[PDB]
């Protein structure tokens, strides 16, 4: 579990030269301090337990902020039920952490933090609210009103969270179609053919394996409308668990631009510094 010790070394005068190498071979010279300078025996007790993949990814990171309202459905701007597209690309921190690798395979844990506030001081009357969060896999009917039949959740998983309680939480297994999630996909979903009537038939988005990759989460307030509008927001935190990764990649160096690998704005990450300045 601990790192290897340091071996004592003495003066060297030999025909074997570990200092010289040739990076052209594509290999890293696996030297140790004892191969270039004299060293003493040191029992090593430092460990790499904090650098493991589990430890690296064992954190919950915000990925979305969903806003819903509780008001009469014909009084103001009606946005009293939302529907969020499940994706980790809405933020930058977790996306950059994940994009160190090409493929990954992990379970996931969702945690929901809900906060509410008033908007008018005329009454100040409102009772405790209950929130419904329904998962709608691709192809399932999507609600088109806050109280239509789709909310019966006959087979869709759904969470009923009462305001003021501990944050809701659930776990999801590896639900990928392939044997590992593909953070990067160098291909298309459709291929145009010479026999196609027009070019737009085979058109597709570059680096987009599928549409509706994981579905949406529908959020509403079960309570009817109080005399005053009440606004609330839902924050979603994702923690990968039991993580395996493959094929490391360089990390992102310039600001993200869209769900692809595009870059527009800055393209100048490094700062100025003299060549011979400490």
């Amino acid at each position, epitope marked *: 579990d601990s790192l290897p010790d340091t071996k004592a070394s003495g003066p060297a005068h030999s025909k074997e030269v570990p200092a010289l190498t040739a990076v052209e071979t594509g290999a890293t010279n696996p030297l140790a301090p004892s191969d270039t300078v004299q060293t003493r025996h040191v029992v090593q007790r430092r460990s790499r337990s904090e650098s493991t993949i589990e430890s690296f990814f064992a954190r919950g990171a915000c990925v979305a902020i969903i806003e819903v309202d509780n008001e009469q459905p014909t009084t103001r701007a*009606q*946005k009293l*039920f939302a529907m969020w597209r499940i994706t980790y690309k809405d933020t930058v921190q977790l996306r950059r952490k994940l994009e160190f690798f090409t493929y990954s395979r992990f379970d996931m844990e969702f945690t929901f933090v809900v906060t509410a506030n008033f908007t008018n001081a005329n009454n100040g009357h409102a009772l405790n609210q209950v929130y419904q969060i329904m998962y709608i896999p691709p192809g399932a009917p999507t609600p088109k009103s806050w109280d239509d039949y789709t909310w019966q959740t006959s087979s869709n998983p759904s969470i009923f969270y009462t305001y003021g309680a501990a944050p809701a939480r659930i776990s999801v297994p590896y639900v990928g179609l392939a044997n590992a999630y593909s953070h990067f996909y160098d291909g298309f979903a*459709k291929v145009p053919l010479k026999t196609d009537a027009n070019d737009q038939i085979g058109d597709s988005l570059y680096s987009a394996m599928t549409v509706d990759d994981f579905g949406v989460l529908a959020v509403r307030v079960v309570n009817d409308h109080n005399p005053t509008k009440v606004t609330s927001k839902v924050r979603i935190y994702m923690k990968p668990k039991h993580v395996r990764v493959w094929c490391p990649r360089p990390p992102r160096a310039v600001p993200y631009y869209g769900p692809g690998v595009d870059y527009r704005n800055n393209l100048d990450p490094l700062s100025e510094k003299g060549l011979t300045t400490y």
Partner: antibody
Amino acid sequence: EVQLVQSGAEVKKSGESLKISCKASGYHFTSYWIGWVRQMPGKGLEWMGFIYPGDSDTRYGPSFQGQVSISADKSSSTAYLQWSRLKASDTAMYFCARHGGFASSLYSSSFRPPDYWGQGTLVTVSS
Amino acid sequence: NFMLTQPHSVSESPGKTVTISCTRSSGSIASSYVQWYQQRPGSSPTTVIYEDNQRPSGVPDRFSGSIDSSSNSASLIISGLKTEDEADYYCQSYDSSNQVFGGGTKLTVL
């Protein structure tokens, strides 16, 4: 019946302010939003605004900031489209629209488009 | 920002069948729903299709809407064309906050 009635063709000289109205029948006018759509001769339709008396959101056209304005009147169950300074490029056919309702979403799912239209109004200068 | 391209134009004869297309160019196609509007010569626009699966009052079943998620294209199929189908057809959308109209397709029936 659930219908929107506009005024017939309207004529004004260049540089003046014009105002046209769209009146609803058979229901309360301000149940939901009112949208105004323009169609220049031989071209596709275009957006002008989507307004509602709660805040009178006069969402102008990108190239017509301020020139085009919209408002609603609860007493007469009518909405009005107003131009501040007419130009030769404002010669078009204007339609007022409205959706029966059903809109409850923060996002595209149920923030709906109109399903009933007016007969349209024409803005020209006779010649 | 984005457009709703349409096919140039179609000229047919009564009893034919056509499929008018409309290709979206931005926003997730599966999120917002495309529509269709018919404007007969010298007439106001009318609503014929929206939500991708709901049809308004007074529309004969001869007109049906359909979508292709992968290609971001919406289709309108007319089976058994009629001489009274002579009109312009526009595909309309509502992405998240505003409506964007298409370029318009002219259909001719002899």
